[PDB]
């Protein structure tokens, strides 16, 4: 279902790894010429996609990830990684492998993986 960005019962914090996810991973991807389709939730009205929200049941976007980081919603950097992988997986599910949006997602995913690989230990 659509994703919350705060939850009073859910433990939340900002570790050194979560700070790295915000200040290095998200911020690097944000300043990329191909990031703009991912700043906000997919807009099925503007794109005229009657089936998007029938097929994609766990939507995710980088704006939601940013808000989760800003709210100290996560407990672990692994949860932030989860959200990025949901974002990419959804794009690859819904779109055809040759579409412009998939090529853009693949370029961002390559940078995501490089920055995660250089994340420091907790």
């Amino acid at each position: 279902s659509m994703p919350e960005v705060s939850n009073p019962s859910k433990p939340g914090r900002k570790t050194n790894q979560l700070q790295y996810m915000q200040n290095v991973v998200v911020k690097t991807l944000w300043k990329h010429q191909f990031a703009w389709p991912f700043y906000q939730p997919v807009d099925a009205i503007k794109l005229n996609l009657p089936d998007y929200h029938k097929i994609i049941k766990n939507p995710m976007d980088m704006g939601t990830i940013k808000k989760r980081l800003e709210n100290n919603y996560y407990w672990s950097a692994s949860e932030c990684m989860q959200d990025f992988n949901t974002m990419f997986t959804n794009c690859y599910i819904y779109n055809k492998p040759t579409d412009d949006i998939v090529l853009m997602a693949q370029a961002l995913e390559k940078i995501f993986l490089q920055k995660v690989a250089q994340m420091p230990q907790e």
């Binding site: 389709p37 996609l49 779109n95 412009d100 949006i101």
Partner: peptide, 6 residues
């Protein structure tokens, strides 16, 4: 089906 993008 999102079409052409830059």
């Amino acid at each position: 089906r999102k079409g052409v993008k830059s």
